[PDB]
Amino acid sequence: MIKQRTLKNIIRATGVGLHSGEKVYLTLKPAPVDTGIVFSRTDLDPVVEIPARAENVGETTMSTTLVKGDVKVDTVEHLLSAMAGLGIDNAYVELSASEVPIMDGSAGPFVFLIQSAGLQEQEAAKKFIRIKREVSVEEGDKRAVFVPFDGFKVSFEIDFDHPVFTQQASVDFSSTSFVKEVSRARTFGFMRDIEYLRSQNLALGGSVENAIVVDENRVLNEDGLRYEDEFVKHKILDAIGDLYLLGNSLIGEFRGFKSGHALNNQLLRTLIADKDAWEVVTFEDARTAPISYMRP
Ligand SMILES: COC[C@@H](O)c1ccc(C#Cc2ccc(C(=O)NC[C@H]3C[C@@H](NC(=O)[C@@H]4C[C@H](F)CN4)CN3C(=O)C3CC3)cc2)cc1
Ligand SMILES: [Zn+2]
Numbered sequence: 364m365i366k367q368r369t370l371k372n373i374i375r376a377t378g379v380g381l382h383s384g385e386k387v388y389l390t391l392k393p394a395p396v397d398t399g400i401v402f403s404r405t406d407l408d409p410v411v412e413i414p415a416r417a418e419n420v421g422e423t424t425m426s427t428t429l430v431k432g433d434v435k436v437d438t439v440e441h442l443l444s445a446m447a448g449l450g451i452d453n454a455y456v457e458l459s460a461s462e463v464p465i466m467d468g469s470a471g472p473f474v475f476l477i478q479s480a481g482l483q484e485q486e487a488a489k490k491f492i493r494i495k496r497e498v499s500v501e502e503g504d505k506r507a508v509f510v511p512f513d514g515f516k517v518s519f520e521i522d523f524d525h526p527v528f529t530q531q532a533s534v535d536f537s538s539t540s541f542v543k544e545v546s547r548a549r550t551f552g553f554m555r556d557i558e559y560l561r562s563q564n565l566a567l568g569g570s571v572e573n574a575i576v577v578d579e580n581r582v583l584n585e586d587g588l589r590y591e592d593e594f595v596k597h598k599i600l601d602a603i604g605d606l607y608l609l610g611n612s613l614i615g616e617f618r619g620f621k622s623g624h625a626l627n628n629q630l631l632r633t634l635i636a637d638k639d640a641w642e643v644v645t646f647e648d649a650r651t652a653p654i655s656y657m658r659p
Pocket of ligand 2: 440441550601
């Protein structure tokens with residue numbers, strides 16, 4: 364059968380919060396069957412824990428935020444994308460501060476730290492959410508859709524009127540490596556936006572070392588892009604992180620059109636509410652299942 368996965372070993376990492384500019388110590392820990400992903404602010408006494416579930420998502424600010432009262436964890440989407448891409452079901456994420464470290468601006472450093480630890484299969488069937496019906500959310504010119512699909516696929520389109528800006532990509536993850544083709548795609552920022560955010564005490568940890576910095580015309584990063592389509596690949600990365608707040612891996616297709624965290628969360632809420640549009644399924648036989656995972 365397809366089995367739940369956690370970490371084999373604890374992972375420790377250091378970085379800076381994109382927005383906070385705060386040094387943050389990150390620990391990923393193995394967790395029991397049916398824990399899901401749980402974030403933990405260990406700088407607090409008592410320690411405050413927020414399950415990485417759509418119901419805990421906060422005011423859809425600059426990034427995906429988990430809240431519980433007046434406690435938050437900022438910018439969870441790149442880490443959850445790394446955990447989604449590798450099929451991790453159960454894990455404790457401990458943070459010394461309010462924001463997940465940005466690292467290089469991609470999921471690459473997290474996927475590497477996790478695959479360095481290795482994964483442990485657990486004695487329990489992995490539960491999948493299978494899309495049975497199309498679920499569509501729109502707001503203005505933005506659109507986010509689930510389509511039934513025997514597998515896992517993410518299609519994305521962006522549309523910037525900007526000299527730097529392939530603005531479309533589709534990845535079937537059963538035939539294309541999240542690790543190689545998506546995970547290294549970095550966050551990006553326009554200089555006019557970054558100058559505004561800085562003026563408002565935001566982007567305090569931003570640098571060419573953790574973001575593609577774009578002025579009116581070109582990428583300012585001396586070493587350029589990792590992919591010709593890095594921008595729309597990063598959109599796909601962020602969508603994979605947000606999808607993982609369902610708390611179960613998806614069997615279906617996601618289509619984004621200029622979508623972002625706020626509409627992505629409207630789509631998760633609408634899917635969860637419409638119980639006719641999905642079912643929980645397990646696979647007693649991995650060989651006939653529409654998705655596959657790497658060796659642990
Ligand atoms: C040494 O410093 C000195 C100096 O040079 C310097 C250099 C750099 C910085 C910085 C920085 C920085 C600040 C904010 C952002 C950001 O929010 N990007 C949003 C982008 C990326 C994507 N969204 C995402 O990736 C979401 C949102 C987060 F980005 C994570 N997930 C969607 N998206 C948009 O659609 C944009 C067009 C609206 C990125 C980088 C500061 C100072
Ligand atoms: Zn991002």
